[PDB]
Every structure is written in C-alpha cells, then in structure tokens.
Amino acid sequence: SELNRKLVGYFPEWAYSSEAQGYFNVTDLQWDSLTHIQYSFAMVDPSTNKITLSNKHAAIEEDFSEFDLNYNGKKIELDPSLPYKGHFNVLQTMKKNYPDVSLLISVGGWTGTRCFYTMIDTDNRINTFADSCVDFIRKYGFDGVDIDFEYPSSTSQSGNPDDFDLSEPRRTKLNERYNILIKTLREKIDMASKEDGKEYLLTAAVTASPWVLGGISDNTYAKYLDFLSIMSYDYHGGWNEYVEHLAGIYPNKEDRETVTQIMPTLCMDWAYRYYRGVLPAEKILMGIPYYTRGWENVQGGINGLHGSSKTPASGKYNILGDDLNNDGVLEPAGANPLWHVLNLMEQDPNLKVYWDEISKVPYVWQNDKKVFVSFENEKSIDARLEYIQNKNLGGALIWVMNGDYGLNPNYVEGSNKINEGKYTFGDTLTKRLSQGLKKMGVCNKTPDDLNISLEPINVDVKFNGKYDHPNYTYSIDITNYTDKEIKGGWNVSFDLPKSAVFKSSWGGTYSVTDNGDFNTITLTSGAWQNIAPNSTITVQGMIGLCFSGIRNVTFNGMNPIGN
Ligand SMILES: [Cl-]
Ligand SMILES: [Cl-]
Ligand code: NA
Missing domain, CATH: 2.60.40.290 (Immunoglobulin-like)
Known part of the structure; x- marks a missing residue:
C-alpha cells in the first residue's frame, strides 16, 4: 500500500472568508481525486512549545452559517455530535464518505516557522512538541503530521526575514537539531500508532533551492518520512529580474539565472536528483503550483520568457498579492490562482498562452502590456504525469488546492469581479492528475544499494x-x-x-x-x-x-x- 501513487493537496485555512481566494472551504476540496489532504497550517506556541492553531476560529469554531457548505449538490451540515466545529468538523464529516483519504496537519510554512527555532533548542522542548502532535492528531482525527520548517538551513538569511532574530544566531546547529526533531516525531508517532491500532504518518515539505540546500548537510531525516514533498515551485518570481518559469520540470540551459552554473538547478528534476542521495523515487513527491508569479514591463525575451523586469505584475494580474498594511494596496507579485488567469484570457484576446517544450510548462504573455505570468494547464499536467511514471515518483503534492479551476456558478457575462468570471475553483487539473496516476499503476520498489x-x-x-x-x-x-x-x-x-x-x-x-x-x-x-x-x-x-x-x-x- 505504501507503493500506491499519492496525490497530496494543501488545504488553505484562510481561503473561505477571502474574495481573492474564492471563498474556498472544505466542501470545495477535490475529495474524489486526492489521496491526502494537508491542513495548512498549525504553528508552535512561543511559550508552551506545543502545536497550536493559527486561525483557531476557522479551524474549530466557525459554523459556516454565512457560507455555502455543499457537496455533490447536497447541503453539508456540520456533525452536531463532534465537540468542535470549524474546518476540522467539515473534514471529519466528509471523511465518513471518503474514509481512504488521509488527513494530515501541516506545521510551519512561511509564516508559521518562527517558533520552531526556539522549540528545537532543547531535547525536552522537542519531546514536548512531539507529544503535543500526538495529542492533537488523536483529538481532531488526523492521520499524521507534516513538517514544513522553512528552513532548517545554515544558509545565512534564508527563511522568513521576520525571523532572522531567531534563525541567524542558530545557523550552525539548525540542520542537526532538525534531524533530532524529525527522528523524535517518528518515534513518538510510531508508538501512538501501536497504542491506537492506527497507521499514523509523518511527512515533510522540503526546499528545492540549491541556495538553501547548501546549508543542509545531513538529510538522514528523510528516511523517517512516509514521503518527502519537494517544493518544486517558487523557483522564479518578482524578487529578482529573471523572467523565468515558476515551476519548470526539466533543466533549461536558457534559464538566465543559472546560465553560468555547471548545470541548471531551478527545476524539479535537479531537486529529484539531489534527494535521490537519501531516498528512493517512490518516496519522493513532485510539487505542483496552482498559482502564478509574474512581471510587467518585461524587456527583451521571446514572448517575455528569458526577459528582464524590475517590476512584478500588479493590479488585475496580482489578485493574490499580499496586503502588507491593509490598505487594499497589494504588493506586486504577479500572483493569481489559475482560474483567474483563465478569466483574464476570456476578457483579453491578446493575453495568450505559450508552451515551453524544454521546461515543459506553459506561460502567459500579453505582448502589448509586456506582462509575463507563469501558468499550469492540461499540457503541463500531462508532462508531469510522464515524469512521475518515468522516474517512479511517489506522486505529487499541490500548492494550494483552491487554484485549480472549473465552471463558475456565479458567472456574470461582462463582469470584472474576481468571483463572477467564467471560471472559479474546481478540479479540472486535479482530476486529470488523479486519472493519470491511476492509469500508470503502483510504484516499483527500488532495490537496495x-x-x-x-x-x-x-x-x-x-x-x-x-x-x-x-x-x-x-x-x-x-x-x-x-x-x-x-x-x-x-x-x-x-x-x-x-x-x-x-x-x-x-x-x-x-x-x-x-x-x-x-x-x-x-x-x-x-x-x-x-x-x-x-x-x-x-x-x-x-x-x-x-x-x-x-x-x-x-x-x-x-x-x-x-x-
Ligand atoms: Cl475514499
Ligand atoms: Cl500550452
Ligand atoms: Na513529455
């Protein structure tokens, strides 16, 4: 059963109340296609070192009276017999009809890593945290724990800059202490499995960045994971000038950022080779984005690709931009869910899609405004399936599930409102992935050295x-x-x-x-x-x-x- 292909989706706790996120809730998850759901996200408490919720109200209190909980055209009611409401109630309620879909709590992420730095300082704090994870998955009916520490690396100035006050003094020990963290989690979770007669999981989402990985020497922790999820996205974006692909599959000698290096590194396949040092392919997952990054006023390139820009795409090309000061003024990033880019193309015949046969991802280019945005479509899903089969990969993880697309029940012809376009969230690409993973069959067992x-x-x-x-x-x-x-x-x-x-x-x-x-x-x-x-x-x-x-x-x- 461990050789089954995996299709792992991150559920965004924050999406259900947000216009830009489509008001996506648990009943919008692609339950028929996912094998695992990673709940994004929990954190570490600064004072107790125990696992803790980010938006506690969303997770266990929201009754969704003002929202639309329905699945397969039937209204979904919260289970009144559970001692909590929120997303967690809906997850458990849906699970009754999808008993083979595994639920994991993901701890960390870009904004939830901060208190990992102090929690790993001592073995007693690690033990406390690991015990609290066991308590938590028992209480809320989770099947496992996903660790998304961004990042346990000695690389100076990696991770969230807001956390430099904790990460920078600790660089020389982070990799060693992270290995102890993962090993301790495995030990405690395995004991809980035996006690409960359940098979609890421990997974991790890990960097694909050569820069971060230069400061990660010991990767023994990977052997304690049920699977290792390569974050093979965010390779390129508005933080620098290189108009290049967010999530290329294959090495591209024309990627301007790495043209002088001994090989192109900002692609899934490089990270695959990197992690093969410690894992077989069938324990490795490919990361797939359902969002974009992009640039405007692109100079040079061909259809924008391999051009340069100091100005990330803004306005209608950046509906997922971070609001730094609640002004509604979003930080430019060219960041959109896939369905919004589809809606933009319905409205603008000069916003066109192109295919890169080297990297095997698509991209979107507006030749008059000089706007380039990364993209993901059926053709790249098919290329990703071919790669998964060719390399015997365990499957794929998806960041984040509300970026897939389908037809919008609230479509209004001629409307420019974010949620009144032809498309909203859906399961088009995720169903296509699921069908392809079924067709190719189970993984092979990689022989021993x-x-x-x-x-x-x-x-x-x-x-x-x-x-x-x-x-x-x-x-x-x-x-x-x-x-x-x-x-x-x-x-x-x-x-x-x-x-x-x-x-x-x-x-x-x-x-x-x-x-x-x-x-x-x-x-x-x-x-x-x-x-x-x-x-x-x-x-x-x-x-x-x-x-x-x-x-x-x-x-x-x-x-x-x-x-
Ligand atoms: Cl099922
Ligand atoms: Cl295409
Ligand atoms: Na192919």
Whole structure:
C-alpha cells in the first residue's frame, strides 16, 4: 500500500472568508481525486512549545452559517455530535464518505516557522512538541503530521526575514537539531500508532533551492518520512529580474539565472536528483503550483520568457498579492490562482498562452502590456504525469488546492469581479492528475544499494565534507579494522547524485561511471597509501554543487561494514 501513487493537496485555512481566494472551504476540496489532504497550517506556541492553531476560529469554531457548505449538490451540515466545529468538523464529516483519504496537519510554512527555532533548542522542548502532535492528531482525527520548517538551513538569511532574530544566531546547529526533531516525531508517532491500532504518518515539505540546500548537510531525516514533498515551485518570481518559469520540470540551459552554473538547478528534476542521495523515487513527491508569479514591463525575451523586469505584475494580474498594511494596496507579485488567469484570457484576446517544450510548462504573455505570468494547464499536467511514471515518483503534492479551476456558478457575462468570471475553483487539473496516476499503476520498489549484496570487509568508510558554493570539498576517512595491513592501490567507490559533478581527486586516480540517477565515483589510491591495522587514512577532493548524501559505498569490491 505504501507503493500506491499519492496525490497530496494543501488545504488553505484562510481561503473561505477571502474574495481573492474564492471563498474556498472544505466542501470545495477535490475529495474524489486526492489521496491526502494537508491542513495548512498549525504553528508552535512561543511559550508552551506545543502545536497550536493559527486561525483557531476557522479551524474549530466557525459554523459556516454565512457560507455555502455543499457537496455533490447536497447541503453539508456540520456533525452536531463532534465537540468542535470549524474546518476540522467539515473534514471529519466528509471523511465518513471518503474514509481512504488521509488527513494530515501541516506545521510551519512561511509564516508559521518562527517558533520552531526556539522549540528545537532543547531535547525536552522537542519531546514536548512531539507529544503535543500526538495529542492533537488523536483529538481532531488526523492521520499524521507534516513538517514544513522553512528552513532548517545554515544558509545565512534564508527563511522568513521576520525571523532572522531567531534563525541567524542558530545557523550552525539548525540542520542537526532538525534531524533530532524529525527522528523524535517518528518515534513518538510510531508508538501512538501501536497504542491506537492506527497507521499514523509523518511527512515533510522540503526546499528545492540549491541556495538553501547548501546549508543542509545531513538529510538522514528523510528516511523517517512516509514521503518527502519537494517544493518544486517558487523557483522564479518578482524578487529578482529573471523572467523565468515558476515551476519548470526539466533543466533549461536558457534559464538566465543559472546560465553560468555547471548545470541548471531551478527545476524539479535537479531537486529529484539531489534527494535521490537519501531516498528512493517512490518516496519522493513532485510539487505542483496552482498559482502564478509574474512581471510587467518585461524587456527583451521571446514572448517575455528569458526577459528582464524590475517590476512584478500588479493590479488585475496580482489578485493574490499580499496586503502588507491593509490598505487594499497589494504588493506586486504577479500572483493569481489559475482560474483567474483563465478569466483574464476570456476578457483579453491578446493575453495568450505559450508552451515551453524544454521546461515543459506553459506561460502567459500579453505582448502589448509586456506582462509575463507563469501558468499550469492540461499540457503541463500531462508532462508531469510522464515524469512521475518515468522516474517512479511517489506522486505529487499541490500548492494550494483552491487554484485549480472549473465552471463558475456565479458567472456574470461582462463582469470584472474576481468571483463572477467564467471560471472559479474546481478540479479540472486535479482530476486529470488523479486519472493519470491511476492509469500508470503502483510504484516499483527500488532495490537496495548493491553494496549490501557484496562480501563484507571490516573497513569503515566515512564520507564528510564542507560546501562553499559551488565547491564541495570532501574528506573520506578509511579505517582498517582487519588484522592485516591493506596494501596501497586499494579503491573505494561511492554513488554521487547527478545533482553534482565530481571534479577532482587530490591523490591517486579516479573514474566516473554512469549509474542511473548517480555517477559511480571510483577512487584508486597509490601504492604508498597502505592502511595499517586499527589505523585511518584520509583522502580528499572536489565536487561541484551539492547532494543530499552518497550511496552504495564499496571498498576493494566488498561491503565496508566497519567494526
Ligand atoms: Cl475514499
Ligand atoms: Cl500550452
Ligand atoms: Na513529455
């Protein structure tokens, strides 16, 4: 059952009362197509270090008397026998008719990560938080916990700048403490599963940014997750000048932001290769956006793409813009749900859609106003399905579910009101994904690393290093725990994810052999590099770009099992 394809959707707690979000509530979720629903979002309490609700009223108090709760044309009433109302009541009520859809509480996000920084400071606070997550999923009928820490990285000035006062003093330890957090959550959740006779889940949404990942050395935490959701979006946007795709699939040598790097990194497939260092494909999910980012007054490019702009798209091209000071004056971002862009194209014949066959995503370009907005449509869904099948991926996650589209019951011909266009939210793309995931069948089980099938040798191989972008300097310690000297000319091999390129060994010689999502690096030492019994020898070299970890380590054609 763990090899089943997954279609994971984030539910926005905030949407049901917001015009720009379409007033999307739980009865608008794509229940027939999703396998998992991630409730966005919970946080960590600053004083108790326990899981806590963001909008408590929305989550457990709202009666929706002023809103339209209906599903399949039938009015949905809150279950009066539950001791809470809100979204959580509607979720549990719907779950009765969709018992195989898993519900998870997502903790964190861009604005909910702040108190993670102080909670991870001590093991007792981590224990308190993990225990509180168990209490919470029991109380509210959740099937698991999703951790969306943005970001547990040493990279200076990553994460929300509002939190620099907490993150910057902690950079050197965040990755280590995050690994303890995830491991502790797994331990507590597994115990609760046994106690309750339920199979509770632990998942995480994780960065796809090479910049953030340069400060994330230990990715062992991934092995404690039921699945790892790659946030393969927000690659490009109004924060800089590069008019490029929000969520490209394949590496694009024409992406101006990375044209000089050793390979194009701002695409799903680069992050896939990165995380293959620690996970099989069937535990990795592709992130899919149902929103846009964009620019206006675009200079150069072709249909805007690969042009430049210092002015993100504004006005009707930015209905999801953040309102920083409640003026109704939204920060330019070119950010829209997909249905709004469809409505804009109904009204403007010169707002046209184009296809990028390299990145395999669409984009929208207004040639008179010079407006470029990223996009997502049936063609990109089909390309994403092909990728998921080709790579044996676990499936996809969607950010956020109210951006999919369908026909609007409140359509008014000629209206420019946000919720009176031809389209509103719907399930067009999500149903198409679900159908394609069904058609391709379950994932294959990725075989174990081949090294475990080899004869053992009592040699310990330890791979460490330091990243100074774009250079990874590795140091490998090889300890001979046998009772005989190992002669020089020994070789060690390891599989290096194709997110990185082996550059040089500083001693001996090396070969590079293609091995799927990896290159097998074989380092052959010189005759003088004898390893005495109970002694350690260290070799170094250089790798370009970063990687989640290395795999399939061998020594002299055998499995190094250390001591
Ligand atoms: Cl179901
Ligand atoms: Cl297209
Ligand atoms: Na394709």
